[PDB]
Amino acid sequence: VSQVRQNYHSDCEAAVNRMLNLELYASYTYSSMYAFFDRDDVALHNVAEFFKENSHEEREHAEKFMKYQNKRGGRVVLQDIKKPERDEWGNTLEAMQAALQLEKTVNQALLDLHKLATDKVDPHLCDFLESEYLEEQVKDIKRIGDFITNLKRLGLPENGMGEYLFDKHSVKES
């Protein structure tokens, strides 16, 4: 038993390792979307940079779980980071639809981890999830939903001028 460990269930320790892996998986998916929008035959550089920044934030989310695991006296166990589900992402609308689903998958895993922490009476882990993960997920889901609504209004997938304008006006200039 780690000398620091107190009120930290083995099941929560394992679930934190699985959550860590899912954050790395989400990072890698966003890396793939960055590389796709940087292609010469796609060439939507502000969209590409949005996904690159998301990739970096998800890696930071994973590192924060590593630090958390060690603070509680659990032991980080790593698994392979699976490659993303697609090699090419169609267009900005298809990519944003995939991002929305990814963010809701990550959110569901965080909510499931909160349920487990509640069941094991771990208020520190509950607070960590509520204070560091759950609100950022709601905000990032809302942002992507707003983007999808605007891509549909702009006539995606058919309206190339609409796609061009989204990249200029909806995502930060990079």
Given the rule CB under 5 A, which residues bind Cl ion?
A: 5, 7-10, 14, 17, 77, 86-88, 101-102, 105, 111, 135-136, 155, 158-159
Residues between 108 and 137 that touch Mg ion (CB under 5 A) = 130, 135
Chain residue whose CB lies nearest Mg ion: 10
Least separation, in Å, of the C-beta of 31 and its own copies? 7
136 marked as part of a ligand binding site: no
Residue among 108, 114, 117 at smallest CA distance from 141: 108
Told to check if 111 binds its own copies by CB under 8 A, we report yes
Least separation, in Å, of the C-beta of 87 and Cl ion? 4
Closest to Cl ion by CB, 70 vs 101, is: 101
CA distance linking residue 83 with residue 78, whole number of Å = 15
Q: How far is CA 16 from CA 31, 71, 99, 119, in A?
A: 23, 12, 22, 15
The CB density around residue 114, as the number of other CB atoms within 10 Å, is: 18
Told to check if 104 binds its own copies by CB under 8 A, we report yes
Told to check if 90 binds its own copies by CB under 8 A, we report no
Residue 43 binding result from Mg ion, its own copies, Cl ion, none, given CB thresholds of 5 to 8 Å by partner type: its own copies
When binding is defined by CB under 5 A, the residue of 40, 87, 158, 173 that contacts Mg ion is 158
Residue 119 binding result from its own copies, Cl ion, Mg ion, none, given CB thresholds of 5 to 8 Å by partner type: none
Q: Tokens at residue 71, please?
A: 């603070």
Four-residue CA torsion sign, 130, 131, 136, 139: positive
Q: Which helix (H) or strand (E) is 61 found in, with range?
A: helix 45-72
What is the secondary structure of 108-171 as a DSSP string?
A: HHHHHHHHHHHHTT-HHHHHHHIIIIIHHHHHHHHHHHHHHHHHHHTTTTT-HHHHHHHHHHTS
Residue 140 binding result from Mg ion, its own copies, Cl ion, none, given CB thresholds of 5 to 8 Å by partner type: Mg ion
Binding residues for Fe cation, as ranges, are 23, 58, 61, 103, 137, 140
